[PDB]
Structures are given as C-alpha cells and as structure tokens.
PDB file of N, CA and C and ligand atoms in Angstrom:
ATOM      1  N   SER A   1      23.987 -11.556   4.947  1.00 45.74           N
ATOM      2  CA  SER A   1      24.667 -10.374   5.460  1.00 45.74           C
ATOM      3  C   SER A   1      23.696  -9.248   5.866  1.00 45.74           C
ATOM      4  N   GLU A   2      23.594  -8.993   7.167  1.00 44.49           N
ATOM      5  CA  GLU A   2      22.656  -7.998   7.662  1.00 44.49           C
ATOM      6  C   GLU A   2      23.290  -7.038   8.663  1.00 44.49           C
ATOM      7  N   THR A   3      22.719  -5.839   8.779  1.00 42.67           N
ATOM      8  CA  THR A   3      23.082  -4.890   9.832  1.00 42.67           C
ATOM      9  C   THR A   3      22.010  -4.926  10.914  1.00 42.67           C
ATOM     10  N   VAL A   4      22.424  -4.978  12.173  1.00 44.54           N
ATOM     11  CA  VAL A   4      21.469  -5.011  13.276  1.00 44.54           C
ATOM     12  C   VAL A   4      21.355  -3.612  13.865  1.00 44.54           C
ATOM     13  N   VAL A   5      20.118  -3.152  14.008  1.00 42.40           N
ATOM     14  CA  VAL A   5      19.828  -1.873  14.617  1.00 42.40           C
ATOM     15  C   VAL A   5      18.982  -2.116  15.849  1.00 42.40           C
ATOM     16  N   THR A   6      19.392  -1.512  16.955  1.00 44.70           N
ATOM     17  CA  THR A   6      18.710  -1.678  18.226  1.00 44.70           C
ATOM     18  C   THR A   6      18.196  -0.344  18.757  1.00 44.70           C
ATOM     19  N   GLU A   7      16.924  -0.336  19.117  1.00 45.10           N
ATOM     20  CA  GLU A   7      16.285   0.889  19.600  1.00 45.10           C
ATOM     21  C   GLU A   7      15.376   0.571  20.759  1.00 45.10           C
ATOM     22  N   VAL A   8      15.595   1.232  21.886  1.00 43.61           N
ATOM     23  CA  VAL A   8      14.676   1.154  23.032  1.00 43.61           C
ATOM     24  C   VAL A   8      14.426   2.597  23.503  1.00 43.61           C
ATOM     25  N   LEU A   9      13.257   3.189  23.256  1.00 45.87           N
ATOM     26  CA  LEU A   9      11.965   2.539  23.052  1.00 45.87           C
ATOM     27  C   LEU A   9      10.992   3.199  22.044  1.00 45.87           C
ATOM     28  N   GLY A  10      11.321   4.359  21.460  1.00 45.12           N
ATOM     29  CA  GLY A  10      10.405   4.975  20.481  1.00 45.12           C
ATOM     30  C   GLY A  10      10.035   6.472  20.303  1.00 45.12           C
ATOM     31  N   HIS A  11      10.159   6.899  19.037  1.00 44.43           N
ATOM     32  CA  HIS A  11       9.583   8.111  18.443  1.00 44.43           C
ATOM     33  C   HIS A  11       9.864   8.123  16.934  1.00 44.43           C
ATOM     34  N   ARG A  12      11.109   7.807  16.567  1.00 44.14           N
ATOM     35  CA  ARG A  12      11.469   7.441  15.191  1.00 44.14           C
ATOM     36  C   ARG A  12      12.806   6.679  15.128  1.00 44.14           C
ATOM     37  N   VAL A  13      12.984   5.864  14.087  1.00 45.68           N
ATOM     38  CA  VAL A  13      14.201   5.073  13.908  1.00 45.68           C
ATOM     39  C   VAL A  13      14.502   4.885  12.423  1.00 45.68           C
ATOM     40  N   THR A  14      15.774   4.967  12.053  1.00 47.70           N
ATOM     41  CA  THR A  14      16.174   4.822  10.653  1.00 47.70           C
ATOM     42  C   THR A  14      16.951   3.519  10.387  1.00 47.70           C
ATOM     43  N   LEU A  15      16.646   2.850   9.276  1.00 51.24           N
ATOM     44  CA  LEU A  15      17.310   1.600   8.903  1.00 51.24           C
ATOM     45  C   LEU A  15      18.185   1.882   7.696  1.00 51.24           C
ATOM     46  N   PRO A  16      19.518   1.721   7.836  1.00 52.78           N
ATOM     47  CA  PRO A  16      20.461   2.179   6.805  1.00 52.78           C
ATOM     48  C   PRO A  16      20.434   1.383   5.509  1.00 52.78           C
ATOM     49  N   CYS A  17      20.453   2.101   4.390  1.00 51.54           N
ATOM     50  CA  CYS A  17      20.657   1.490   3.096  1.00 51.54           C
ATOM     51  C   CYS A  17      21.278   2.494   2.162  1.00 51.54           C
ATOM     52  N   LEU A  18      22.455   2.146   1.652  1.00 52.25           N
ATOM     53  CA  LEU A  18      23.227   3.006   0.775  1.00 52.25           C
ATOM     54  C   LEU A  18      23.620   2.266  -0.500  1.00 52.25           C
ATOM     55  N   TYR A  19      23.460   2.933  -1.639  1.00 51.95           N
ATOM     56  CA  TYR A  19      23.881   2.394  -2.929  1.00 51.95           C
ATOM     57  C   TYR A  19      24.563   3.530  -3.691  1.00 51.95           C
ATOM     58  N   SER A  20      25.856   3.698  -3.464  1.00 49.67           N
ATOM     59  CA  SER A  20      26.539   4.931  -3.854  1.00 49.67           C
ATOM     60  C   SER A  20      26.630   5.206  -5.348  1.00 49.67           C
ATOM     61  N   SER A  21      26.543   4.171  -6.167  1.00 51.37           N
ATOM     62  CA  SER A  21      26.681   4.365  -7.611  1.00 51.37           C
ATOM     63  C   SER A  21      25.359   4.729  -8.291  1.00 51.37           C
ATOM     64  N   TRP A  22      24.298   4.821  -7.486  1.00 53.14           N
ATOM     65  CA  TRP A  22      22.942   5.172  -7.931  1.00 53.14           C
ATOM     66  C   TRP A  22      22.895   6.183  -9.081  1.00 53.14           C
ATOM     67  N   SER A  23      22.049   5.909 -10.070  1.00 54.79           N
ATOM     68  CA  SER A  23      21.795   6.847 -11.155  1.00 54.79           C
ATOM     69  C   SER A  23      20.297   7.022 -11.281  1.00 54.79           C
ATOM     70  N   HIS A  24      19.830   8.266 -11.346  1.00 56.78           N
ATOM     71  CA  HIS A  24      18.390   8.523 -11.420  1.00 56.78           C
ATOM     72  C   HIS A  24      17.780   8.008 -12.717  1.00 56.78           C
ATOM     73  N   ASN A  25      18.618   7.818 -13.729  1.00 59.28           N
ATOM     74  CA  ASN A  25      18.170   7.256 -15.003  1.00 59.28           C
ATOM     75  C   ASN A  25      18.149   5.724 -15.041  1.00 59.28           C
ATOM     76  N   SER A  26      18.710   5.070 -14.027  1.00 56.17           N
ATOM     77  CA  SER A  26      18.754   3.604 -14.013  1.00 56.17           C
ATOM     78  C   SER A  26      18.062   2.998 -12.804  1.00 56.17           C
ATOM     79  N   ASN A  27      18.164   3.659 -11.662  1.00 56.81           N
ATOM     80  CA  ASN A  27      17.845   2.982 -10.418  1.00 56.81           C
ATOM     81  C   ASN A  27      16.477   3.306  -9.823  1.00 56.81           C
ATOM     82  N   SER A  28      15.999   2.378  -9.006  1.00 55.07           N
ATOM     83  CA  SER A  28      14.811   2.547  -8.201  1.00 55.07           C
ATOM     84  C   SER A  28      14.951   1.496  -7.120  1.00 55.07           C
ATOM     85  N   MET A  29      14.194   1.615  -6.041  1.00 56.07           N
ATOM     86  CA  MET A  29      14.308   0.650  -4.963  1.00 56.07           C
ATOM     87  C   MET A  29      13.018   0.558  -4.208  1.00 56.07           C
ATOM     88  N   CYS A  30      12.944  -0.412  -3.310  1.00 55.20           N
ATOM     89  CA  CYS A  30      11.789  -0.532  -2.435  1.00 55.20           C
ATOM     90  C   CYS A  30      12.245  -1.200  -1.158  1.00 55.20           C
ATOM     91  N   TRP A  31      11.435  -1.089  -0.117  1.00 55.62           N
ATOM     92  CA  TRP A  31      11.709  -1.789   1.130  1.00 55.62           C
ATOM     93  C   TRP A  31      10.614  -2.809   1.376  1.00 55.62           C
ATOM     94  N   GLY A  32      10.950  -3.910   2.032  1.00 56.14           N
ATOM     95  CA  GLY A  32       9.940  -4.895   2.382  1.00 56.14           C
ATOM     96  C   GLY A  32      10.165  -5.427   3.773  1.00 56.14           C
ATOM     97  N   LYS A  33       9.111  -5.915   4.407  1.00 54.06           N
ATOM     98  CA  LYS A  33       9.206  -6.445   5.761  1.00 54.06           C
ATOM     99  C   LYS A  33       9.235  -7.956   5.736  1.00 54.06           C
ATOM    100  N   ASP A  34      10.118  -8.565   6.532  1.00 54.45           N
ATOM    101  CA  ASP A  34      10.272 -10.039   6.630  1.00 54.45           C
ATOM    102  C   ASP A  34      11.056 -10.684   5.470  1.00 54.45           C
ATOM    103  N   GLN A  35      10.711 -10.325   4.241  1.00 54.98           N
ATOM    104  CA  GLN A  35      11.398 -10.866   3.074  1.00 54.98           C
ATOM    105  C   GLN A  35      11.643  -9.739   2.092  1.00 54.98           C
ATOM    106  N   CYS A  36      12.620  -9.914   1.210  1.00 55.04           N
ATOM    107  CA  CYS A  36      12.808  -8.950   0.138  1.00 55.04           C
ATOM    108  C   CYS A  36      11.585  -8.946  -0.792  1.00 55.04           C
ATOM    109  N   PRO A  37      11.149  -7.756  -1.234  1.00 56.23           N
ATOM    110  CA  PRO A  37      10.091  -7.759  -2.250  1.00 56.23           C
ATOM    111  C   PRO A  37      10.614  -8.361  -3.558  1.00 56.23           C
ATOM    112  N   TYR A  38       9.706  -8.830  -4.409  1.00 57.53           N
ATOM    113  CA  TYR A  38      10.089  -9.425  -5.678  1.00 57.53           C
ATOM    114  C   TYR A  38      10.532  -8.355  -6.668  1.00 57.53           C
ATOM    115  N   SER A  39      11.300  -8.777  -7.673  1.00 58.21           N
ATOM    116  CA  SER A  39      11.626  -7.934  -8.823  1.00 58.21           C
ATOM    117  C   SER A  39      10.377  -7.178  -9.255  1.00 58.21           C
ATOM    118  N   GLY A  40      10.496  -5.872  -9.442  1.00 57.71           N
ATOM    119  CA  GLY A  40       9.360  -5.067  -9.836  1.00 57.71           C
ATOM    120  C   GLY A  40       8.848  -4.247  -8.684  1.00 57.71           C
ATOM    121  N   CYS A  41       9.169  -4.680  -7.470  1.00 60.54           N
ATOM    122  CA  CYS A  41       8.918  -3.880  -6.267  1.00 60.54           C
ATOM    123  C   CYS A  41       7.447  -3.602  -5.935  1.00 60.54           C
ATOM    124  N   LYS A  42       6.521  -4.440  -6.388  1.00 59.43           N
ATOM    125  CA  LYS A  42       5.114  -4.214  -6.040  1.00 59.43           C
ATOM    126  C   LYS A  42       4.799  -4.770  -4.650  1.00 59.43           C
ATOM    127  N   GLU A  43       3.713  -4.267  -4.055  1.00 58.92           N
ATOM    128  CA  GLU A  43       3.336  -4.577  -2.671  1.00 58.92           C
ATOM    129  C   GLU A  43       4.554  -4.550  -1.743  1.00 58.92           C
ATOM    130  N   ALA A  44       4.988  -3.338  -1.416  1.00 58.47           N
ATOM    131  CA  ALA A  44       6.139  -3.115  -0.558  1.00 58.47           C
ATOM    132  C   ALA A  44       5.767  -2.074   0.483  1.00 58.47           C
ATOM    133  N   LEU A  45       6.672  -1.793   1.415  1.00 57.12           N
ATOM    134  CA  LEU A  45       6.399  -0.784   2.440  1.00 57.12           C
ATOM    135  C   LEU A  45       6.455   0.608   1.842  1.00 57.12           C
ATOM    136  N   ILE A  46       7.401   0.797   0.932  1.00 59.26           N
ATOM    137  CA  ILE A  46       7.679   2.087   0.331  1.00 59.26           C
ATOM    138  C   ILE A  46       8.486   1.787  -0.921  1.00 59.26           C
ATOM    139  N   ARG A  47       8.493   2.703  -1.878  1.00 59.50           N
ATOM    140  CA  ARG A  47       9.067   2.433  -3.178  1.00 59.50           C
ATOM    141  C   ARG A  47       9.401   3.746  -3.870  1.00 59.50           C
ATOM    142  N   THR A  48      10.441   3.753  -4.699  1.00 59.68           N
ATOM    143  CA  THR A  48      10.853   4.976  -5.378  1.00 59.68           C
ATOM    144  C   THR A  48      11.077   4.699  -6.849  1.00 59.68           C
ATOM    145  N   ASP A  49      11.170   5.755  -7.646  1.00 61.33           N
ATOM    146  CA  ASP A  49      11.792   5.646  -8.957  1.00 61.33           C
ATOM    147  C   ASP A  49      13.222   6.130  -8.833  1.00 61.33           C
ATOM    148  N   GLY A  50      13.721   6.802  -9.860  1.00 59.97           N
ATOM    149  CA  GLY A  50      15.076   7.318  -9.808  1.00 59.97           C
ATOM    150  C   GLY A  50      15.259   8.565  -8.963  1.00 59.97           C
ATOM    151  N   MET A  51      14.156   9.255  -8.649  1.00 54.82           N
ATOM    152  CA  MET A  51      14.197  10.561  -7.978  1.00 54.82           C
ATOM    153  C   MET A  51      13.521  10.616  -6.601  1.00 54.82           C
ATOM    154  N   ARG A  52      12.393   9.931  -6.450  1.00 51.80           N
ATOM    155  CA  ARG A  52      11.505  10.174  -5.314  1.00 51.80           C
ATOM    156  C   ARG A  52      10.613   8.984  -4.969  1.00 51.80           C
ATOM    157  N   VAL A  53      10.096   8.959  -3.744  1.00 51.93           N
ATOM    158  CA  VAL A  53       9.077   7.978  -3.372  1.00 51.93           C
ATOM    159  C   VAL A  53       7.922   8.081  -4.361  1.00 51.93           C
ATOM    160  N   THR A  54       7.296   6.959  -4.691  1.00 49.03           N
ATOM    161  CA  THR A  54       6.198   6.963  -5.654  1.00 49.03           C
ATOM    162  C   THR A  54       4.965   6.295  -5.080  1.00 49.03           C
ATOM    163  N   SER A  55       5.127   5.635  -3.936  1.00 50.79           N
ATOM    164  CA  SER A  55       4.008   5.089  -3.163  1.00 50.79           C
ATOM    165  C   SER A  55       4.542   4.479  -1.873  1.00 50.79           C
ATOM    166  N   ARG A  56       3.666   4.276  -0.894  1.00 50.46           N
ATOM    167  CA  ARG A  56       4.042   3.617   0.349  1.00 50.46           C
ATOM    168  C   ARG A  56       2.820   2.985   1.004  1.00 50.46           C
ATOM    169  N   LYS A  57       3.043   1.993   1.858  1.00 50.42           N
ATOM    170  CA  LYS A  57       1.948   1.312   2.543  1.00 50.42           C
ATOM    171  C   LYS A  57       1.210   2.261   3.491  1.00 50.42           C
ATOM    172  N   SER A  58       1.949   3.171   4.121  1.00 48.47           N
ATOM    173  CA  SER A  58       1.341   4.231   4.936  1.00 48.47           C
ATOM    174  C   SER A  58       2.332   5.329   5.191  1.00 48.47           C
ATOM    175  N   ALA A  59       1.880   6.336   5.930  1.00 50.01           N
ATOM    176  CA  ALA A  59       2.666   7.537   6.189  1.00 50.01           C
ATOM    177  C   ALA A  59       3.779   7.266   7.194  1.00 50.01           C
ATOM    178  N   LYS A  60       3.683   6.112   7.849  1.00 51.91           N
ATOM    179  CA  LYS A  60       4.637   5.677   8.849  1.00 51.91           C
ATOM    180  C   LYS A  60       6.054   5.491   8.264  1.00 51.91           C
ATOM    181  N   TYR A  61       6.173   5.422   6.940  1.00 50.19           N
ATOM    182  CA  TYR A  61       7.464   5.173   6.296  1.00 50.19           C
ATOM    183  C   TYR A  61       7.925   6.347   5.461  1.00 50.19           C
ATOM    184  N   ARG A  62       9.166   6.770   5.677  1.00 46.14           N
ATOM    185  CA  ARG A  62       9.699   7.948   5.015  1.00 46.14           C
ATOM    186  C   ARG A  62      11.096   7.644   4.485  1.00 46.14           C
ATOM    187  N   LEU A  63      11.525   8.407   3.494  1.00 45.06           N
ATOM    188  CA  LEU A  63      12.880   8.340   3.017  1.00 45.06           C
ATOM    189  C   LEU A  63      13.405   9.770   2.991  1.00 45.06           C
ATOM    190  N   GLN A  64      14.316  10.090   3.909  1.00 41.29           N
ATOM    191  CA  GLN A  64      14.699  11.481   4.136  1.00 41.29           C
ATOM    192  C   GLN A  64      15.988  11.901   3.453  1.00 41.29           C
ATOM    193  N   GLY A  65      16.787  10.925   3.026  1.00 40.66           N
ATOM    194  CA  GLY A  65      18.062  11.220   2.407  1.00 40.66           C
ATOM    195  C   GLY A  65      17.893  11.515   0.934  1.00 40.66           C
ATOM    196  N   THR A  66      18.980  11.890   0.267  1.00 38.23           N
ATOM    197  CA  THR A  66      18.919  12.177  -1.160  1.00 38.23           C
ATOM    198  C   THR A  66      18.869  10.859  -1.956  1.00 38.23           C
ATOM    199  N   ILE A  67      17.711  10.579  -2.550  1.00 37.97           N
ATOM    200  CA  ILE A  67      17.478   9.386  -3.339  1.00 37.97           C
ATOM    201  C   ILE A  67      18.335   9.364  -4.604  1.00 37.97           C
ATOM    202  N   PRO A  68      18.439  10.498  -5.327  1.00 40.21           N
ATOM    203  CA  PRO A  68      19.389  10.531  -6.456  1.00 40.21           C
ATOM    204  C   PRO A  68      20.873  10.293  -6.104  1.00 40.21           C
ATOM    205  N   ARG A  69      21.214  10.202  -4.821  1.00 39.96           N
ATOM    206  CA  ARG A  69      22.583   9.889  -4.402  1.00 39.96           C
ATOM    207  C   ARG A  69      22.646   8.497  -3.780  1.00 39.96           C
ATOM    208  N   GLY A  70      21.520   7.793  -3.784  1.00 41.13           N
ATOM    209  CA  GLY A  70      21.486   6.449  -3.247  1.00 41.13           C
ATOM    210  C   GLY A  70      21.333   6.381  -1.743  1.00 41.13           C
ATOM    211  N   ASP A  71      20.967   7.499  -1.129  1.00 43.50           N
ATOM    212  CA  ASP A  71      20.678   7.517   0.302  1.00 43.50           C
ATOM    213  C   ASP A  71      19.214   7.138   0.475  1.00 43.50           C
ATOM    214  N   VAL A  72      18.947   5.834   0.509  1.00 43.60           N
ATOM    215  CA  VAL A  72      17.586   5.318   0.477  1.00 43.60           C
ATOM    216  C   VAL A  72      17.203   4.651   1.791  1.00 43.60           C
ATOM    217  N   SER A  73      17.889   5.023   2.871  1.00 44.47           N
ATOM    218  CA  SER A  73      17.538   4.517   4.201  1.00 44.47           C
ATOM    219  C   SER A  73      16.068   4.782   4.530  1.00 44.47           C
ATOM    220  N   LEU A  74      15.429   3.820   5.194  1.00 45.15           N
ATOM    221  CA  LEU A  74      14.028   3.912   5.582  1.00 45.15           C
ATOM    222  C   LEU A  74      13.898   4.553   6.962  1.00 45.15           C
ATOM    223  N   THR A  75      13.060   5.578   7.085  1.00 45.92           N
ATOM    224  CA  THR A  75      12.697   6.084   8.409  1.00 45.92           C
ATOM    225  C   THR A  75      11.319   5.561   8.769  1.00 45.92           C
ATOM    226  N   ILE A  76      11.193   4.991   9.957  1.00 50.44           N
ATOM    227  CA  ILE A  76       9.923   4.509  10.470  1.00 50.44           C
ATOM    228  C   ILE A  76       9.447   5.424  11.625  1.00 50.44           C
ATOM    229  N   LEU A  77       8.317   6.115  11.437  1.00 50.77           N
ATOM    230  CA  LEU A  77       7.764   6.977  12.494  1.00 50.77           C
ATOM    231  C   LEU A  77       7.112   6.143  13.595  1.00 50.77           C
ATOM    232  N   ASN A  78       7.267   6.600  14.831  1.00 50.14           N
ATOM    233  CA  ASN A  78       6.624   5.992  15.986  1.00 50.14           C
ATOM    234  C   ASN A  78       6.673   4.471  16.003  1.00 50.14           C
ATOM    235  N   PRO A  79       7.884   3.913  16.061  1.00 49.82           N
ATOM    236  CA  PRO A  79       7.991   2.460  15.924  1.00 49.82           C
ATOM    237  C   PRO A  79       7.531   1.741  17.184  1.00 49.82           C
ATOM    238  N   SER A  80       7.031   0.514  17.042  1.00 47.25           N
ATOM    239  CA  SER A  80       6.574  -0.241  18.204  1.00 47.25           C
ATOM    240  C   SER A  80       7.032  -1.672  18.077  1.00 47.25           C
ATOM    241  N   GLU A  81       6.785  -2.475  19.107  1.00 49.29           N
ATOM    242  CA  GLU A  81       7.203  -3.876  19.139  1.00 49.29           C
ATOM    243  C   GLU A  81       6.967  -4.618  17.828  1.00 49.29           C
ATOM    244  N   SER A  82       5.767  -4.501  17.255  1.00 49.00           N
ATOM    245  CA  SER A  82       5.475  -5.251  16.028  1.00 49.00           C
ATOM    246  C   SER A  82       6.293  -4.751  14.827  1.00 49.00           C
ATOM    247  N   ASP A  83       6.949  -3.605  14.986  1.00 48.36           N
ATOM    248  CA  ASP A  83       7.840  -3.095  13.942  1.00 48.36           C
ATOM    249  C   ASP A  83       9.188  -3.799  13.923  1.00 48.36           C
ATOM    250  N   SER A  84       9.432  -4.635  14.933  1.00 51.52           N
ATOM    251  CA  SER A  84      10.653  -5.433  15.011  1.00 51.52           C
ATOM    252  C   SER A  84      10.749  -6.387  13.845  1.00 51.52           C
ATOM    253  N   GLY A  85      11.952  -6.894  13.615  1.00 51.88           N
ATOM    254  CA  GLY A  85      12.140  -7.994  12.698  1.00 51.88           C
ATOM    255  C   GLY A  85      13.026  -7.590  11.547  1.00 51.88           C
ATOM    256  N   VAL A  86      12.966  -8.389  10.496  1.00 52.90           N
ATOM    257  CA  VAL A  86      13.834  -8.235   9.349  1.00 52.90           C
ATOM    258  C   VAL A  86      13.224  -7.295   8.320  1.00 52.90           C
ATOM    259  N   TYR A  87      14.062  -6.482   7.703  1.00 52.64           N
ATOM    260  CA  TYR A  87      13.623  -5.597   6.635  1.00 52.64           C
ATOM    261  C   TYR A  87      14.646  -5.782   5.531  1.00 52.64           C
ATOM    262  N   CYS A  88      14.228  -5.559   4.291  1.00 53.19           N
ATOM    263  CA  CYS A  88      15.113  -5.743   3.165  1.00 53.19           C
ATOM    264  C   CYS A  88      15.025  -4.600   2.175  1.00 53.19           C
ATOM    265  N   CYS A  89      16.174  -4.048   1.857  1.00 54.21           N
ATOM    266  CA  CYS A  89      16.263  -2.918   0.961  1.00 54.21           C
ATOM    267  C   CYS A  89      16.691  -3.439  -0.402  1.00 54.21           C
ATOM    268  N   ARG A  90      15.792  -3.363  -1.377  1.00 53.83           N
ATOM    269  CA  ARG A  90      16.056  -3.955  -2.685  1.00 53.83           C
ATOM    270  C   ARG A  90      16.410  -2.903  -3.729  1.00 53.83           C
ATOM    271  N   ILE A  91      17.662  -2.879  -4.179  1.00 48.13           N
ATOM    272  CA  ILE A  91      18.067  -1.937  -5.219  1.00 48.13           C
ATOM    273  C   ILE A  91      17.815  -2.518  -6.599  1.00 48.13           C
ATOM    274  N   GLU A  92      17.067  -1.799  -7.416  1.00 51.53           N
ATOM    275  CA  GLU A  92      16.782  -2.310  -8.741  1.00 51.53           C
ATOM    276  C   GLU A  92      17.840  -1.849  -9.713  1.00 51.53           C
ATOM    277  N   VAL A  93      18.465  -2.819 -10.369  1.00 48.79           N
ATOM    278  CA  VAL A  93      19.579  -2.566 -11.260  1.00 48.79           C
ATOM    279  C   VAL A  93      19.215  -3.146 -12.620  1.00 48.79           C
ATOM    280  N   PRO A  94      19.518  -2.410 -13.698  1.00 45.33           N
ATOM    281  CA  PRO A  94      19.164  -2.862 -15.053  1.00 45.33           C
ATOM    282  C   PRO A  94      19.744  -4.225 -15.418  1.00 45.33           C
ATOM    283  N   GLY A  95      18.939  -5.047 -16.083  1.00 45.06           N
ATOM    284  CA  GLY A  95      19.323  -6.410 -16.393  1.00 45.06           C
ATOM    285  C   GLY A  95      18.602  -7.346 -15.454  1.00 45.06           C
ATOM    286  N   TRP A  96      18.784  -8.638 -15.642  1.00 46.42           N
ATOM    287  CA  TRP A  96      18.141  -9.598 -14.773  1.00 46.42           C
ATOM    288  C   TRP A  96      19.139 -10.297 -13.861  1.00 46.42           C
ATOM    289  N   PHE A  97      18.619 -10.852 -12.766  1.00 48.84           N
ATOM    290  CA  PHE A  97      19.433 -11.600 -11.806  1.00 48.84           C
ATOM    291  C   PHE A  97      20.613 -10.795 -11.278  1.00 48.84           C
ATOM    292  N   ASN A  98      20.376  -9.524 -10.963  1.00 51.03           N
ATOM    293  CA  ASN A  98      21.456  -8.632 -10.562  1.00 51.03           C
ATOM    294  C   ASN A  98      21.035  -7.537  -9.551  1.00 51.03           C
ATOM    295  N   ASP A  99      19.821  -7.619  -9.020  1.00 50.29           N
ATOM    296  CA  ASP A  99      19.371  -6.620  -8.053  1.00 50.29           C
ATOM    297  C   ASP A  99      20.130  -6.834  -6.751  1.00 50.29           C
ATOM    298  N   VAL A 100      20.454  -5.740  -6.067  1.00 51.58           N
ATOM    299  CA  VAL A 100      21.151  -5.795  -4.786  1.00 51.58           C
ATOM    300  C   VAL A 100      20.175  -5.886  -3.601  1.00 51.58           C
ATOM    301  N   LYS A 101      20.427  -6.825  -2.693  1.00 52.93           N
ATOM    302  CA  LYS A 101      19.554  -7.024  -1.535  1.00 52.93           C
ATOM    303  C   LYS A 101      20.266  -6.721  -0.216  1.00 52.93           C
ATOM    304  N   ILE A 102      19.861  -5.636   0.448  1.00 53.68           N
ATOM    305  CA  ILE A 102      20.460  -5.251   1.729  1.00 53.68           C
ATOM    306  C   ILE A 102      19.501  -5.488   2.893  1.00 53.68           C
ATOM    307  N   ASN A 103      19.949  -6.250   3.880  1.00 55.41           N
ATOM    308  CA  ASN A 103      19.119  -6.606   5.018  1.00 55.41           C
ATOM    309  C   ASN A 103      19.494  -5.886   6.299  1.00 55.41           C
ATOM    310  N   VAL A 104      18.475  -5.424   7.012  1.00 53.64           N
ATOM    311  CA  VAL A 104      18.649  -4.804   8.307  1.00 53.64           C
ATOM    312  C   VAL A 104      17.695  -5.527   9.228  1.00 53.64           C
ATOM    313  N   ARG A 105      18.179  -5.992  10.370  1.00 51.82           N
ATOM    314  CA  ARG A 105      17.282  -6.508  11.393  1.00 51.82           C
ATOM    315  C   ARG A 105      17.016  -5.405  12.422  1.00 51.82           C
ATOM    316  N   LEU A 106      15.756  -5.013  12.599  1.00 56.83           N
ATOM    317  CA  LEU A 106      15.424  -3.991  13.598  1.00 56.83           C
ATOM    318  C   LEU A 106      15.018  -4.621  14.924  1.00 56.83           C
ATOM    319  N   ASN A 107      15.805  -4.359  15.964  1.00 55.00           N
ATOM    320  CA  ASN A 107      15.431  -4.740  17.325  1.00 55.00           C
ATOM    321  C   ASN A 107      14.767  -3.584  18.032  1.00 55.00           C
ATOM    322  N   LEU A 108      13.444  -3.619  18.126  1.00 56.18           N
ATOM    323  CA  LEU A 108      12.759  -2.559  18.835  1.00 56.18           C
ATOM    324  C   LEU A 108      12.277  -3.026  20.195  1.00 56.18           C
ATOM    325  N   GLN A 109      12.887  -2.471  21.240  1.00 58.62           N
ATOM    326  CA  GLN A 109      12.572  -2.890  22.597  1.00 58.62           C
ATOM    327  C   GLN A 109      12.017  -1.773  23.479  1.00 58.62           C
ATOM    328  N   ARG A 110      11.715  -2.152  24.710  1.00 59.26           N
ATOM    329  CA  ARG A 110      11.410  -1.222  25.756  1.00 59.26           C
ATOM    330  C   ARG A 110      12.350  -1.452  26.938  1.00 59.26           C
ATOM    331  N   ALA A 111      12.508  -0.424  27.768  1.00 59.08           N
ATOM    332  CA  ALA A 111      13.320  -0.481  28.973  1.00 59.08           C
ATOM    333  C   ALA A 111      12.741  -1.546  29.900  1.00 59.08           C
ATOM    334  N   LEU A 112      13.594  -2.188  30.695  1.00 60.31           N
ATOM    335  CA  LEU A 112      13.168  -3.341  31.487  1.00 60.31           C
ATOM    336  C   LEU A 112      12.499  -3.020  32.836  1.00 60.31           C
ATOM    337  N   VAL A 113      13.169  -2.231  33.672  1.00 57.98           N
ATOM    338  CA  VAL A 113      12.632  -1.834  34.980  1.00 57.98           C
ATOM    339  C   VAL A 113      12.412  -3.011  35.937  1.00 57.98           C
TER     340      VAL A 113
HETATM  341 CA1   CA B   1      17.710  -6.147 -12.271  1.00 58.31          CA
END
C-alpha cells in the first residue's frame, strides 16, 4: 500500500506520512530510500525521537510538521531525477513486530517539450 506523488520539475517536494495517535513518550520514526529502514532506525535519511529530528543523512531532508502530533512527512529540498523512487516512513511503536510502514513512491520528472 503506497501513495504516489508526482512532481515536475523542482525546488522542494513533500512526501506525506501521518501517525495521528503519536505520543512523544512512545514514538519515534525514520525515513528510508528504496526499502524501509530496519527496527532501530539506524542508517536512514532522517530520524526523530518523540519530539524532534535527531540526525539526518544531509540537509536536503527536513521535517516541517509537528512531530509530537505525528506530522512526520519528509520534505526534500531541491529534488532531482535521482531523488525518484520508493521511500518508506517507519513509525516505531513499543513492542516487537508492530512498527507501522508507510510507503510513498516519488515520481520526479521534468517537462517534455
Ligand atoms: Ca516496535
């Protein structure tokens, strides 16, 4: 189950991810490219605890919504062709075998002419 986002041709683009029951005392999440990151959320594009981003692969990735409300959509600055493809938003939920995996396919194109 994925949401498809289409953008032609570039300055910034947001990939939706919402987890409305989010609690700052329980939740954290991360984003990954091509595949969902593993439990624990290491080596990811960007990652949060219950309140805020705590690391990212580069400045190209932002989270602008309220993280304590589960607005964890990824903003990608200056996106380009290689930014296309599958992305996965992994919600970390207490317990095992219960993390939520949300997929967005980003179609980043240019005008045809
Ligand atoms: Ca879990």
